Each structure stands twice: as structure tokens, then as C-alpha cells.
Design a protein around this ligand. Structure first.
Ligand SMILES: Nc1nc2c(ncn2[C@@H]2O[C@H](COP(=O)(O)OP(=O)(O)O)[C@@H](O)[C@H]2O)c(=O)[nH]1
Lengths: 330, 18
């Protein structure tokens, strides 16, 4: 009979790191949450992935519907008039996948529409109706995702878009630190919940969609998307709650920005910009636009990283560096 | 600084916090 050892086995309580995820809608917060699960937890099991099949189908249907309606508003004709019929069927069958089953009929409708020349002409003008950035991801792999045996891959789950109406808390561990991450997905909640969420914050991660720079101003806006993000970052960085908080800036969607800057001038977003329409200089300009909004004491600087939130290796690298920063400032 | 149960926007909360 060997007496059992200690229950702590020589370990002790893990130090807590409270992270606040902030940023405009579609900036990459949910993707960062999922990447934290993939990198520092166990990823997504097969059952969890199965639970996202309905979301994948809904995202795909909603994306193609957005494109068709945008054709309506922009006066873009179908490449072939028969597609009109398909369009009608799309709206008739749009609720048929809510049980995680995409019939061959709906799959064929979506395939024919996505292949049409007018639909593609409208897609190339996505900046004019702010089409979500995962539409083509699913619509170009329709064949794979439309199989009766389809199970969403990890990358598939990463690209899904789900409602984030409140403040959601997730946990992980890394370098013996216990991370409590709070995604502020919504614009409203109870005052006491705001207080509980902003209390004792170790660090903020603020996500910015770079590729938002060329989005057309919609009727529900008073300024363009990038400037809404800048205003939010201003209100956060200079609030009493965060006078001494470590502020990290994820200038995200750098891949889409790299592709867009080739053909869309940054002056669409910043009319005063006189620099070149090239990746590095335009990226530096946006970075300075955001960093100049920090009016805290000089010791309180902003830690900026360029990210592709959907790229697991890049997020792993960037978060490895952010953890070192947090340990330093600890 | 009304009651803790009043649903409020992030902007309103940041404002009253300052
Ligand atoms: N190509 C690319 N797509 C991204 C990136 N970040 C996010 N996306 C996608 O853009 C959509 C919105 O991102 P999401 O995390 O939901 O933003 P949130 O509303 O702040 O939570 C999602 O479909 C993401 O998969 C990126 O860095 N590069």
C-alpha cells in the first residue's frame, strides 16, 4: 500500500490573462476565436464539424442570393436568360437545406448561377454591395460541399459566419497562462455586463479588415467602413478603462488587401492619400492612420501585426509574439 | 450611470465611463 502523492503534484494555479476581442463586424474576431481553439485546444471534432454543415449551406445560399439581388440593383443581366428561372428556383428552395441537406436540384441551380457570366460580372463588383469575404470560398467548392456525405473540414468551419449578438467567453491555455478571451460581437448589452467584461482586462486585440478600404458607402452609414473602424479604435484606445492596457492591433485580411490594392486605389478610402497603390506603402499608411489615434502617454504604444486570420500558421506565429509581449508587460 | 440592468450600447458605455 503506497500512500498516494499530492493532488497538486507540485503544480500551482495558472496565472490568468484576460483578452478582449474588439472590432467591427466581419473584421475577423470569430475566426481568431476558432483559431485559438484549433491551435491551443483540440480543434473541432467530427461531431462539432457536422454541426457546422447547416451553417455552411446557409452561408452559401445567402451569398449567392446576395449576388443575385445585387445584379437586380446594379442592372446586370444574366449571361443566359434561362438563368432567370434558376434564380426563381433559388428563392423557392432557399429553405430546403435548413436540415443540413442540399438537394441535387438546389446544388445544380447554384452551380449554374455561379457559372453564369453576368453573375460573375456582379461578383467582381462585390465592393458595391459589401459581399461577405467567404462567398467564393464555398461557391468554388460547391461540388465538394454538396455531396450527401460531406463533413465540413477544419478550414470549412473557420470560414463559417454565425450570429455573434453578445459577449462570448472562451478559454484556452498557452505557456502556462490561462487565457480567458471575450469576443465583443454585439453592440448592446446590460451595463453590468459591460462592467464585468471590461474589468481587469490584461490585453485588447482589435481586428481591422484592411480589405474594407474600397467598400462603397451604404445608406445605413455616415462614413465608410474603415473610418467606422478607426472611430471605434479611437473610442477604445482612449477610454479610461484602458489607460494602461496592452493594445494589440490585428490589421487582418492582408491577403485580400494584397489582391485588392493592385486594382483598387487607396484614395477610395482616404481621398487625401498621395502615396503609391502598392501593398507595403498602403499598408503602412493604414497602420499609421490607426496608430495615430492612440493619444495615451508615450509609454502606452500600440502593438501592430498584419494577419490573415484564416491562416492557422500565421495566427500561431502572431499569437506566439503577442503572448511574449503580454509576458513582458506583465 | 443608471441601473446595471439597463441594456446599453458600447458607445454609450464608453461615454459614461469617461
Ligand atoms: N481571405 C481571408 N478571409 C478572412 C480573414 N478573416 C476573416 N475572414 C472571413 O471573413 C468572414 C468574417 O470574419 P469573422 O471572424 O466572422 O468577423 P467577426 O464578425 O468580427 O466575427 C468570415 O467568413 C471569415 O472567415 C482573412 O484574414 N483573410
Amino acid at each position: 500500500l503506497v500512500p498516494r502523492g499530492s493532488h497538486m503534484d507540485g503544480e500551482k494555479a495558472a496565472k490568468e490573462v484576460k483578452l478582449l476581442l474588439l472590432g467591427a463586424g466581419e473584421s475577423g474576431k470569430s475566426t481568431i476565436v476558432k483559431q485559438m481553439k484549433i491551435i491551443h485546444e483540440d480543434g473541432y471534432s467530427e461531431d462539432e464539424c457536422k454541426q457546422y454543415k447547416v451553417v455552411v449551406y446557409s452561408n452559401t445560399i445567402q451569398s449567392i442570393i446576395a449576388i443575385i439581388r445585387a445584379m437586380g440593383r446594379l442592372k446586370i443581366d444574366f449571361g443566359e436568360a434561362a438563368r432567370a428561372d434558376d434564380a426563381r428556383q433559388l428563392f423557392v428552395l432557399a429553405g430546403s437545406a435548413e436540415e443540413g441537406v442540399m438537394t441535387s436540384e438546389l446544388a445544380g441551380v447554384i452551380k449554374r448561377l455561379w457559372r453564369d457570366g453576368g453573375v460573375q460580372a456582379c461578383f467582381s463588383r462585390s465592393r458595391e454591395y459589401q459581399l461577405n469575404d467567404s462567398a467564393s470560398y464555398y461557391l468554388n467548392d460547391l461540388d465538394r460541399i454538396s455531396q450527401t456525405n460531406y463533413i465540413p473540414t477544419q478550414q470549412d468551419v473557420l470560414r463559417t459566419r454565425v450570429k455573434t449578438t453578445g459577449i462570448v467567453e472562451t478559454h484556452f491555455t498557452f505557456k502556462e497562462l490561462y487565457f480567458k478571451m471575450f469576443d465583443v460581437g454585439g453592440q448592446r448589452s446590460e451595463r453590468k455586463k459591460w462592467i464585468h467584461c471590461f474589468e481587469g482586462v490584461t490585453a485588447i486585440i482589435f481586428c481591422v479588415a484592411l480589405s474594407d478600404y474600397d467598400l462603397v458607402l451604404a445608406e445605413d452609414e455616415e462614413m465608410n467602413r474603415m473610418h467606422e473602424s478607426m472611430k471605434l479604435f479611437d473610442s477604445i484606445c482612449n477610454n479610461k478603462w484602458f489607460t494602461d492596457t496592452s493594445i494589440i492591433l490585428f490589421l487582418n485580411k492582408k491577403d485580400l488587401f494584397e489582391e485588392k490594392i493592385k486594382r483598387s486605389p487607396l484614395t477610395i478610402c482616404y481621398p487625401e492619400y498621395t502615396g503609391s497603390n502598392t501593398y507595403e506603402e498602403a499598408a503602412a499608411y493604414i497602420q499609421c492612420q490607426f496608430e495615430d489615434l492612440n493619444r495615451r502617454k508615450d509609454t502606452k504604444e500600440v502593438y501592430t501585426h498584419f494577419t490573415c486570420a484564416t491562416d492557422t500558421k500565421n495566427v500561431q506565429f502572431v499569437f506566439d509574439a503577442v503572448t511574449d509581449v503580454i509576458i513582458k508587460n506583465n | 450611470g443608471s441601473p446595471g440592468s439597463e441594456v446599453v450600447t458600447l458607445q454609450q458605455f464608453l461615454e459614461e465611463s469617461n
